Design a protein around this motif. Structure first.
Motif, PDB file in Angstrom:
ATOM      1  N   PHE A   1      -8.784 -12.966   7.056  1.00 20.18           N
ATOM      2  CA  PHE A   1      -7.350 -13.159   6.865  1.00 20.18           C
ATOM      3  C   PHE A   1      -6.966 -13.140   5.383  1.00 20.18           C
ATOM      4  CE2 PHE A   1      -3.863 -16.280   6.247  1.00 20.18           C
ATOM      5  CZ  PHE A   1      -2.858 -15.421   6.564  1.00 20.18           C
ATOM      6  N   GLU A   2      -7.709 -13.853   4.550  1.00 24.39           N
ATOM      7  CA  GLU A   2      -7.455 -13.830   3.121  1.00 24.39           C
ATOM      8  C   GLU A   2      -7.485 -12.405   2.589  1.00 24.39           C
ATOM      9  OE1 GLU A   2     -10.410 -15.660   0.750  1.00 24.39           O
ATOM     10  OE2 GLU A   2      -9.150 -15.586  -1.074  1.00 24.39           O
ATOM     11  N   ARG A   3      -8.497 -11.633   2.992  1.00 21.08           N
ATOM     12  CA  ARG A   3      -8.641 -10.261   2.512  1.00 21.08           C
ATOM     13  C   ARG A   3      -7.523  -9.366   3.013  1.00 21.08           C
ATOM     14  NH1 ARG A   3     -15.108  -9.113   2.144  1.00 21.08           N
ATOM     15  NH2 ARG A   3     -15.538 -10.831   0.740  1.00 21.08           N
ATOM     16  N   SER A   4      -7.005  -9.612   4.219  1.00 23.67           N
ATOM     17  CA  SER A   4      -5.897  -8.815   4.716  1.00 23.67           C
ATOM     18  C   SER A   4      -4.646  -9.047   3.883  1.00 23.67           C
ATOM     19  CB  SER A   4      -5.656  -9.118   6.191  1.00 23.67           C
ATOM     20  OG  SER A   4      -4.986 -10.342   6.441  1.00 23.67           O
ATOM     21  N   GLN A   5      -4.477 -10.251   3.345  1.00 28.30           N
ATOM     22  CA  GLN A   5      -3.339 -10.515   2.465  1.00 28.30           C
ATOM     23  C   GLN A   5      -3.525  -9.808   1.135  1.00 28.30           C
ATOM     24  OE1 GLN A   5      -3.152 -14.733   1.871  1.00 28.30           O
ATOM     25  NE2 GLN A   5      -1.640 -14.921   3.510  1.00 28.30           N
ATOM     26  N   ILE A   6      -4.745  -9.847   0.596  1.00 29.57           N
ATOM     27  CA  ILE A   6      -5.055  -9.141  -0.638  1.00 29.57           C
ATOM     28  C   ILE A   6      -4.789  -7.658  -0.470  1.00 29.57           C
ATOM     29  CG2 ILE A   6      -6.966  -8.480  -2.156  1.00 29.57           C
ATOM     30  CD1 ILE A   6      -8.115 -11.369  -1.601  1.00 29.57           C
ATOM     31  N   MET A   7      -5.193  -7.097   0.665  1.00 29.52           N
ATOM     32  CA  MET A   7      -5.001  -5.670   0.902  1.00 29.52           C
ATOM     33  C   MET A   7      -3.535  -5.306   1.048  1.00 29.52           C
ATOM     34  SD  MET A   7      -7.731  -4.058   0.451  1.00 29.52           S
ATOM     35  CE  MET A   7      -7.102  -2.577   1.183  1.00 29.52           C
ATOM     36  N   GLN A   8      -2.738  -6.160   1.683  1.00 27.47           N
ATOM     37  CA  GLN A   8      -1.317  -5.867   1.783  1.00 27.47           C
ATOM     38  C   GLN A   8      -0.685  -5.820   0.402  1.00 27.47           C
ATOM     39  OE1 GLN A   8       1.046  -8.124   4.610  1.00 27.47           O
ATOM     40  NE2 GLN A   8       2.854  -7.836   3.311  1.00 27.47           N
ATOM     41  N   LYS A   9      -1.014  -6.776  -0.450  1.00 26.34           N
ATOM     42  CA  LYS A   9      -0.461  -6.784  -1.799  1.00 26.34           C
ATOM     43  C   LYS A   9      -0.933  -5.580  -2.606  1.00 26.34           C
ATOM     44  CE  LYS A   9       0.289 -11.743  -2.086  1.00 26.34           C
ATOM     45  NZ  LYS A   9      -0.447 -12.353  -0.951  1.00 26.34           N
ATOM     46  N   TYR A  10      -2.191  -5.183  -2.437  1.00 25.12           N
ATOM     47  CA  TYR A  10      -2.718  -3.985  -3.077  1.00 25.12           C
ATOM     48  C   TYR A  10      -1.938  -2.757  -2.634  1.00 25.12           C
ATOM     49  CZ  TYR A  10      -5.769   0.095  -3.403  1.00 25.12           C
ATOM     50  OH  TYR A  10      -6.276   1.347  -3.632  1.00 25.12           O
ATOM     51  N   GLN A  11      -1.722  -2.601  -1.320  1.00 21.86           N
ATOM     52  CA  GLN A  11      -1.007  -1.423  -0.836  1.00 21.86           C
ATOM     53  C   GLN A  11       0.433  -1.434  -1.315  1.00 21.86           C
ATOM     54  OE1 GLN A  11      -2.519   1.071   0.459  1.00 21.86           O
ATOM     55  NE2 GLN A  11      -4.399   0.138   1.234  1.00 21.86           N
ATOM     56  N   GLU A  12       1.061  -2.610  -1.341  1.00 18.99           N
ATOM     57  CA  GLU A  12       2.442  -2.679  -1.810  1.00 18.99           C
ATOM     58  C   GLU A  12       2.539  -2.245  -3.262  1.00 18.99           C
ATOM     59  OE1 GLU A  12       4.518  -6.482  -2.358  1.00 18.99           O
ATOM     60  OE2 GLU A  12       5.949  -5.748  -0.849  1.00 18.99           O
ATOM     61  N   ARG A  13       1.641  -2.730  -4.106  1.00 20.03           N
ATOM     62  CA  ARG A  13       1.635  -2.298  -5.498  1.00 20.03           C
ATOM     63  C   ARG A  13       1.392  -0.797  -5.619  1.00 20.03           C
ATOM     64  NH1 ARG A  13      -1.061  -7.166  -6.008  1.00 20.03           N
ATOM     65  NH2 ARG A  13      -3.059  -6.042  -6.025  1.00 20.03           N
ATOM     66  N   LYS A  14       0.503  -0.240  -4.793  1.00 14.52           N
ATOM     67  CA  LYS A  14       0.231   1.193  -4.830  1.00 14.52           C
ATOM     68  C   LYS A  14       1.478   1.990  -4.471  1.00 14.52           C
ATOM     69  CE  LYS A  14      -3.613   4.201  -3.437  1.00 14.52           C
ATOM     70  NZ  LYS A  14      -4.316   4.009  -4.742  1.00 14.52           N
ATOM     71  N   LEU A  15       2.209   1.530  -3.467  1.00 10.83           N
ATOM     72  CA  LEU A  15       3.441   2.180  -3.060  1.00 10.83           C
ATOM     73  C   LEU A  15       4.474   2.140  -4.173  1.00 10.83           C
ATOM     74  CD1 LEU A  15       5.379   3.434  -1.028  1.00 10.83           C
ATOM     75  CD2 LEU A  15       5.763   1.107  -0.163  1.00 10.83           C
ATOM     76  N   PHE A  16       4.684   0.971  -4.771  1.00 15.83           N
ATOM     77  CA  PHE A  16       5.686   0.863  -5.821  1.00 15.83           C
ATOM     78  C   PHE A  16       5.307   1.726  -7.011  1.00 15.83           C
ATOM     79  CE2 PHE A  16       7.098  -3.599  -4.306  1.00 15.83           C
ATOM     80  CZ  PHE A  16       7.717  -3.027  -3.243  1.00 15.83           C
ATOM     81  N   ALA A  17       4.016   1.764  -7.341  1.00 14.33           N
ATOM     82  CA  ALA A  17       3.567   2.600  -8.451  1.00 14.33           C
ATOM     83  C   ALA A  17       3.794   4.074  -8.151  1.00 14.33           C
ATOM     84  CB  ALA A  17       2.097   2.326  -8.773  1.00 14.33           C
ATOM     85  N   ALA A  18       3.576   4.488  -6.909  1.00 14.82           N
ATOM     86  CA  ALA A  18       3.752   5.893  -6.554  1.00 14.82           C
ATOM     87  C   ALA A  18       5.206   6.316  -6.678  1.00 14.82           C
ATOM     88  CB  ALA A  18       3.256   6.132  -5.133  1.00 14.82           C
ATOM     89  N   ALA A  19       6.132   5.391  -6.445  1.00 15.63           N
ATOM     90  CA  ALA A  19       7.560   5.650  -6.543  1.00 15.63           C
ATOM     91  C   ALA A  19       8.075   5.582  -7.967  1.00 15.63           C
ATOM     92  CB  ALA A  19       8.308   4.639  -5.682  1.00 15.63           C
ATOM     93  N   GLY A  20       7.242   5.155  -8.906  1.00 17.36           N
ATOM     94  CA  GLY A  20       7.618   5.103 -10.299  1.00 17.36           C
ATOM     95  C   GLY A  20       8.101   3.762 -10.788  1.00 17.36           C
ATOM     96  N   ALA A  21       7.932   2.700 -10.004  1.00 18.05           N
ATOM     97  CA  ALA A  21       8.444   1.387 -10.389  1.00 18.05           C
ATOM     98  C   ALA A  21       7.785   0.883 -11.674  1.00 18.05           C
ATOM     99  CB  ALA A  21       8.241   0.396  -9.266  1.00 18.05           C
TER     100      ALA A  21
END
Length: 53
Positions: free
Chosen positions: A33-53
């Motif tokens: 469960f802890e790792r699934s939260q880490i992964m969600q935050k990782y993916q969210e940052r990856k998405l925002f970075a891809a959009a140019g944030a």
């Protein structure tokens, strides 16, 4: 930023997988469960970075 759990989306590498697979069930599920939260935050940052944030 590197994927923190590149093995099956849940483990760092083979020795980490074997460690988690040796744990009592409650501890294993808590860490997953802890790792699934880490992964969600990782993916969210990856998405925002891809959009140019």
């Amino acid at each position: 930023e590197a994927n923190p759990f590149p093995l099956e989306g849940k483990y760092k590498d083979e020795s980490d997988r074997e460690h988690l697979e040796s744990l009592p069930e409650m501890e294993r599920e808590t860490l997953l469960f802890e790792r699934s939260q880490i992964m969600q935050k990782y993916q969210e940052r990856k998405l925002f970075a891809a959009a140019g944030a």
